[PDB]
Amino acid sequence: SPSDFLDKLMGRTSGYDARIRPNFKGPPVNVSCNIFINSFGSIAETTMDYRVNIFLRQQWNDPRLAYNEYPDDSLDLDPSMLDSIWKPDLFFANEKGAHFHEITTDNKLLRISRNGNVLYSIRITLTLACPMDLKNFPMDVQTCIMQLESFGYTMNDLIFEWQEQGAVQVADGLTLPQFILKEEKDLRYCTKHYNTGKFTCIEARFHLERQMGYYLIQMYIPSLLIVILSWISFWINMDAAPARVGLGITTVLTMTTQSSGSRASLPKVSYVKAIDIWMAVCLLFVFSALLEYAAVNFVSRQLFIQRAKKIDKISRIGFPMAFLIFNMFYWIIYKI
Amino acid sequence: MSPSDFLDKLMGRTSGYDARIRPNFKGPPVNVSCNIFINSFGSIAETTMDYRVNIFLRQQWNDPRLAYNEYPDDSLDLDPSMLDSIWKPDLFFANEKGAHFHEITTDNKLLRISRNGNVLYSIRITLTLACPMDLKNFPMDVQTCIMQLESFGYTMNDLIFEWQEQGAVQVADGLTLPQFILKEEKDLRYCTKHYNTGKFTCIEARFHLERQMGYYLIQMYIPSLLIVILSWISFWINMDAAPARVGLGITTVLTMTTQSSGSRASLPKVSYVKAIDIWMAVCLLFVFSALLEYAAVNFVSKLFIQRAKKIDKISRIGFPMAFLIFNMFYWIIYKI
Amino acid sequence: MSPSDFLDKLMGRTSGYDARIRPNFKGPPVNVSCNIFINSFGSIAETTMDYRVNIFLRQQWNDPRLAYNEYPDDSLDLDPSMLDSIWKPDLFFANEKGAHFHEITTDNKLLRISRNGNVLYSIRITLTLACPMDLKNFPMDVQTCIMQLESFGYTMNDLIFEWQEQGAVQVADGLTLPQFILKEEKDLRYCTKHYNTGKFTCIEARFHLERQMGYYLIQMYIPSLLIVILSWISFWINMDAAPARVGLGITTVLTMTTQSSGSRASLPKVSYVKAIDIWMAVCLLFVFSALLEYAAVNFVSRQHMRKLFIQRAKKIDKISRIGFPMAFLIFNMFYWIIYKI
Amino acid sequence: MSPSDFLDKLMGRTSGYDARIRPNFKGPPVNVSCNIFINSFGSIAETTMDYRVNIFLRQQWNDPRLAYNEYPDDSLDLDPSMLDSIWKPDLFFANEKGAHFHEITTDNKLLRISRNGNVLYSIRITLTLACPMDLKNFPMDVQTCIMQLESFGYTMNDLIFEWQEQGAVQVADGLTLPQFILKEEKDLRYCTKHYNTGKFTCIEARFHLERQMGYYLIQMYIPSLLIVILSWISFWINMDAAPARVGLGITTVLTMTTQSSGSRASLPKVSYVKAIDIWMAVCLLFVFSALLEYAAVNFVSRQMRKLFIQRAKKIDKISRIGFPMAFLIFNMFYWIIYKI
Amino acid sequence: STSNILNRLLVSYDPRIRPNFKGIPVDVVVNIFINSFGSIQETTMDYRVNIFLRQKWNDPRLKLPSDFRGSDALTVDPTMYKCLWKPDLFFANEKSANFHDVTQENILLFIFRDGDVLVSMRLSITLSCPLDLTLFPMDTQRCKMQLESFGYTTDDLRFIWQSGDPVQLEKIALPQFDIKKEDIEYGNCTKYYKGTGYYTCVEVIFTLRRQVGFYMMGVYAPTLLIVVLSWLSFWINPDASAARVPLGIFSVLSLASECTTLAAELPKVSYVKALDVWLIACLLFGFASLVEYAVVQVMLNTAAKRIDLYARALFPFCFLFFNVIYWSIYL
Ligand SMILES: *[C@@H]1O[C@H](CO)[C@@H](O)[C@H](O)[C@H]1NC(C)=O
Ligand SMILES: *[C@@H]1O[C@H](CO)[C@@H](O)[C@H](O)[C@H]1NC(C)=O
Ligand SMILES: *[C@@H]1O[C@H](CO)[C@@H](O)[C@H](O)[C@H]1NC(C)=O
Ligand SMILES: *[C@@H]1O[C@H](CO)[C@@H](O)[C@H](O)[C@H]1NC(C)=O
Ligand SMILES: CCCCCCCCCCC
Ligand SMILES: CCCCCCCCCCC
Ligand SMILES: CCCCCCCCCCC
Ligand SMILES: CCCCCCCCCCC
Ligand SMILES: CCCCCCCCCCC
Ligand SMILES: CCCCCCCCCCC
Ligand SMILES: CCCCCCCCCC
Ligand SMILES: CCCCCCCCCC
Ligand SMILES: CCCCCCCCCC
Ligand SMILES: CCCCCCCCC
Ligand SMILES: CCCCCCCCC
Ligand SMILES: CCCCCCCCC
Ligand SMILES: CCCCCCCCC
Ligand SMILES: CCCCCCCC
Ligand SMILES: CCCCCCCC
Ligand SMILES: CCCCCCC
Ligand SMILES: CCCCCCC
Ligand SMILES: CCCCCCC
Ligand SMILES: CCCCCCC
Ligand SMILES: CCCCCCC
Ligand SMILES: CCCCCCC
Ligand SMILES: CCCCCC
Ligand SMILES: CCCCCC
Ligand SMILES: CCCCCC
Ligand SMILES: CCCCCC
């Protein structure tokens, strides 16, 4: 009978104390883990965290769970009984909040092999935290990690290792806005040394590059348009003082508004980002254009007309080259 | 007769019904015919790329050991507070992104055991499903958001999921949505996936969502046409004066930029160019080109006056035709 | 004798009361008379089209196997801790959109078994129901948001829901709402659902909600009126101030564009044309026409040895100056009379 | 010596261990030496005056009725499924403002019963603590946010809390924060409460938090300096360009107003005057006084006719040579005060 | 033994029977200790208080045996209240309340010799109080805290405030408010739900006075500055349109934008408030300045000097008069 077999293997008439580790008073029981990213995404910048929907699996070895009745090797079980089995108590060191999934039933899987291997796959949804470096903000390459780590035992009682092949699998249709996930995923070690002993830890690194399309368009094209607007502000008659000063005014106001929006769209980090330098240089160019026009007006008001026109002409033929060389240096430095 | 005794004999303490083993154990798998009932669709959040649905998921398998002959009735209705002591399917939504039951004044489950062994089961879930969206034709897109019913604990060889033959996905008659509209024909294909731990059965339903132009059409296109007409009137001024030509033009560009910021503030940070973006950029380009033409005419400005006036006339005659040609071409491209 | 013995005899171990079979089993259905007590409205959101209500649902069915005779009291009161061991109806709100109980220092249930068998049951729920709104007359609309009590586990022939004849939907005494104001008359229609499985009982009540025009009126009509008068005082100036008038027109056009953009920030992206969008469009059109007529006057004046061009430009300016305000008054009268009926 | 028998004998059915009476009952109170470990700090909100800390609270009391003699090991380890049947202290954070446990793949509790009777107990909590902030020196403040460990069920004579002598408050190695930087010294004071129902215990830790000046400095001082210099170059222009000067002054006034409104919008609606508010007010006052002195010069130039123009030019030159000096004096005077 | 006393007390003690089942109603005294008073949110008409709710009744079935040592008090674990009858005291203003269990469920329970019990559980109640936004920047709201029973009528349960200090706050220091003295009036608040009976109710009324500082620094100074800017726009009188119109334009636009921005946060109440009155009046003064310039232009296009001198003389006086009237009325 299947009920009698389950009862004798586990529960009342079994003698299985679901409180003692396998291989007690001996070598530690290694727990081979392998996650499966079901759906990535939701990379928030303000909260400095991302949400991942993992399909975590792990398979240890329990010697006191061997059976001999059924000829099958991989006997599948009911996710309503795996609460009466000793299980690893791995926790994510930077979970920042997480929960199970229970829809129409629990979302656990149990599979006891013939020799004693026990598969265990639950469907967790983490919102992990990863410190970011926004120095090269429009073209940054983030590295957000998860740290699988035990909590109950010392290293001598529980060791975590990844599978040799296919440790971190990725869904075929996994797509992201903005960022794009790389292919290589490092599997390092994170052995912790707390005040209460050594606790095992394994971490995986996800290299996350950022697509430059949206940022490029939205906060680069308007800047170029405003710079060209200032350039055509050079291309106007000298006598139109109110017109030129007003056009300089609207260029300055547009740059200020765009800089405020760009700085308000990101967390208030201390250092200067790669796009803040671009905004600052564009604003400085517009302000210097207004300054040089005021200088031309002062010189003309005080042979004076000839030198004012010469200054205007050298300005008109000089700022475009300076802007081009600045653009070339900026793009060559921030693309290496 | 005692209904309490009948229920206890059928299942519970003095029954021998072990509610942990699949019906027809070590034998053929059991189909779980599913048919949902969407009570309230909607909440199409574009920023997070997800939507909320309130289904009445139903399923009816066949349990041979639940056949009864004591009661003369066939469709015996049971209590939704005691169905936790039977075998139940454990289907989960592969892209649920979080979901919960409903428990108000009582549980919201239904149970109905037929005479032969058919068991109805209709719970009331509230999902917030995830569907990647494609925004190439942003105002005229045809979105395809799906729900993937899929089992978790049992293998494909131990389980088959199928949709009901007739009327599988029912829709509330009074259902209505803002923005999108739900189509009548819905696709119901298979999604049998091959995980690393075996083949799991899966069934998905496709929901086709058109987009109403009304809000977007009016509020993003009518102002653009008005500003284009304003630019044409700016062409229709004679030699006039600076404000006449420049002013009219200065407003036109300013408003079309306001239109830019407006069309921009409501979408996720997507990389590729949208469809409304093309129209908005072309409108801005037409306004800027009218301003540049006016300038060139001013730079040109009795023979030079005659040629400048002829250029102005040929512009006022040709630009509306070019705009009409562009409008027709754009609409035919995005309406096929 | 012993209250504990009485409780155990009436339900529990030494009772034989199975709290899984409905009263009048294999017989007529058990009607459940319901009457809510709206403690407080609030949070009537437009973005998500839902309103949060804190109802005080009560109901009273007839359970024959709860009769007692030893006690002389008729309205015997029990505890909200032992009502789980009795049969209860399983009504759910078909458009609840999420809800939860209240559990502070205890639960918030009440059990009151009467002498004959009537059982009162009054739990305290906090619903956030969903009601599709009609925003055609958005600043001057009257809404109708409804709740639908409905059973799920049983059949119309096994469970019928009815409202009380007198005082079916009470209202808190000092109840007030921001924006909307609640009416006095509330409809009580029927809601009998026909699902695929069959007929399930449902009963609904309708709350007629008008909208106050104070806030919308003030802070979305006064600025538009003031900007229109700004265009008028631009009209009331000499024609030599071409840069000044064109700059004022630019500012006013930008202001109306910005205000119209800020109009829709707090409303859903509804397809059809609202009530106040027409007003904003007409104000924008009036400012646009003011700038346009300035352009026309500049064209006429500069079209020029005759003073007839200047004379006709001045005549055009004067006639527009005296005419616009009348046209705005006519539009305002038409709009108000047609949208206040 | 079966593990199943030994665990039951030590606690549970065949033990006689009543997990409802404190150790050393009807006697001296039991010390509970505590030592937290900041796993991940941050999320320092300004509007709600709260910060989220992810601790790893540990505590080790002495229960004499848990001693064992069978196993030769001293640091015996027990089950996170067992500690619900032993007496535990009930410390609660007096300013928790909301908290929750952590349960992923299992609970997150550690139990370690020593040979003599010491019982280690380390849970993983994620508090969102509340600390009132003094925003007088807002861009350069040194905040002090605290947590108060304290039980809830006993009296002073029943349960004593103390900090560990060496290494009481540990910090994760690679811990970093946006904006603020967490110091090294952490005061460990006493916060013993005297409620209406008796004297209760209260141990607190102080985290001194400085504020980095980068973002605030750049994004709300560089534009202000640029606009003030724009007002100065408005000074350095022709007197006849009345519309140009008026427009430039109006633009500077509008920019300062918008920047002040934006700066005020990122902080709670506090009553007193901040440190950046003084700077923004002074910059706005300088811009307004600049436009006003232009207005005065324009009035003077109109109303010896030639002498009036000469004195107007003299006033303009005095303004253009003096304003910047006054602004430099104000800048030095302001920076020397809010740095001491 | 040690716990045998409480086992004997709780054996044959039915927790489903209130004390004096057929006798007089149990008199429950209530004491509240506000550990931390939260920030009131004008947007949603609610605030978040954090109290150490305390109750104390008399249970004759829980008299301590004469063999009990210790003077009067017998404290027990927080995990034992499940076997004791407890009043079903609930808050009638709560929106979404919460318990508190960070390490163990925070409930204290004292038992005296005469049978009195003292439950001092901790809550995180989130009340709702309807504000009165007339005189908005200078208002004194009164936000309540109603405690009432649910499942027992007045014949069984009644709540009486403690004869000492029912509220024991020590230091609060709200970010934008300040509470000094409050009244515990409407002590009796018993409600009568139709067809059910009389339910006991008690009520605490606070006085959340609002500090003017932020708003006096928020709108008063910028608006006064803009009005003075319009005055100095009068002062120049260059008769240059391109230099005189933009000042009035900027004044009007800045007033409109500031009004919209500062009103985009308060709840959408429908009645004139002090802030709206001030903004409307100052915006009207700016518009009247622009109309004055327009009339100067039309009269000049008796001289413009006379009318400009009159305006420069009278607008500062009129504004000062309005300011005095406004402050006197609203203070
Ligand atoms: C349906 O269920 C029966 C049950 O024995 C099974 O044999 C069959 O494979 C299932 N699938 C089909 C063909 O519907
Ligand atoms: C409920 O009312 C229906 C309609 O008259 C009736 O069949 C039934 O007797 C009532 N309830 C009872 C007593 O079963
Ligand atoms: C610490 O524990 C000892 C023994 O129980 C007790 O005597 C002492 O009073 C406790 N702590 C203090 C200093 O109160
Ligand atoms: C409050 O009034 C009710 C209603 O009459 C009454 O039953 C009760 O005795 C009164 N209690 C107090 C505290 O005055
Ligand atoms: C809801 C009453 C509305 C009364 C008419 C208001 C008219 C305001 C505009 C006047 C020009
Ligand atoms: C809700 C009553 C509203 C009365 C009218 C207020 C008008 C305020 C603006 C006056 C210029
Ligand atoms: C509810 C009475 C409204 C009276 C008319 C108010 C008009 C205010 C605007 C005046 C320009
Ligand atoms: C220009 C007149 C505006 C007010 C019209 C009022 C019409 C009557 C309304 C009755 C509710
Ligand atoms: C490491 C300190 C950085 C301080 C900010 C520097 C800003 C430089 C750019 C200013 C336009
Ligand atoms: C806390 C008292 C605040 C008084 C008002 C200060 C105003 C400063 C800005 C003036 C432009
Ligand atoms: C109700 C139909 C709406 C059709 C699209 C909007 C038309 C706007 C016309 C001004
Ligand atoms: C760069 C995006 C091109 C999109 C397709 C071509 C559009 C032609 C519009 C006239
Ligand atoms: C207290 C009455 C307020 C009436 C509306 C505002 C009048 C403003 C006049 C300047
Ligand atoms: C059904 C909407 C038709 C909109 C037509 C607009 C025509 C503009 C010239
Ligand atoms: C909108 C303001 C009109 C002012 C007209 C003044 C007429 C004076 C004769
Ligand atoms: C269905 C709304 C029609 C509104 C017509 C307004 C006409 C104004 C002149
Ligand atoms: C952290 C010190 C900053 C000093 C800034 C001085 C700016 C002088 C114009
Ligand atoms: C409490 C401060 C009141 C200030 C009133 C305004 C004084 C000019
Ligand atoms: C500018 C006048 C202020 C008056 C304040 C009120 C004095 C009683
Ligand atoms: C990789 C993106 C290069 C942009 C160059 C713009 C001139
Ligand atoms: C790899 C991208 C190089 C861009 C060069 C731009 C000059
Ligand atoms: C479809 C209704 C259009 C009304 C337009 C009014 C100007
Ligand atoms: C800040 C303006 C400087 C002008 C210098 C002119 C020589
Ligand atoms: C010119 C002011 C310098 C201040 C330096 C403070 C460290
Ligand atoms: C604390 C007040 C400082 C004022 C400085 C004025 C320059
Ligand atoms: C692929 C990005 C194209 C952007 C063109 C402006
Ligand atoms: C890292 C600094 C780059 C500066 C480019 C102008
Ligand atoms: C269906 C929309 C057509 C728009 C033509 C301008
Ligand atoms: C302007 C032409 C529109 C055609 C739509 C099918």
Ligand SMILES: CCCCCC
């Ligand atoms: C030119 C294409 C017309 C299509 C009409 C349906």
Ligand SMILES: CCCCCC
């Ligand atoms: C919309 C106003 C038109 C006036 C024509 C004289």
Ligand SMILES: CCCCCC
């Ligand atoms: C505290 C008063 C500050 C004034 C600054 C001008």
Ligand SMILES: CCCCCC
């Ligand atoms: C800004 C001060 C001006 C003084 C004129 C006499």
Ligand SMILES: CCCCCC
């Ligand atoms: C603005 C003040 C001018 C005073 C002239 C005597």
Ligand SMILES: CCCCCC
């Ligand atoms: C800040 C004072 C300036 C004075 C100019 C005359």
Ligand SMILES: CCCCCC
């Ligand atoms: C930056 C200071 C400039 C001073 C010119 C006189």
Ligand SMILES: CCCCCC
């Ligand atoms: C509106 C003010 C008019 C003043 C006329 C002397």
Ligand SMILES: CCCCCC
């Ligand atoms: C701003 C004050 C003006 C005084 C005129 C006599």
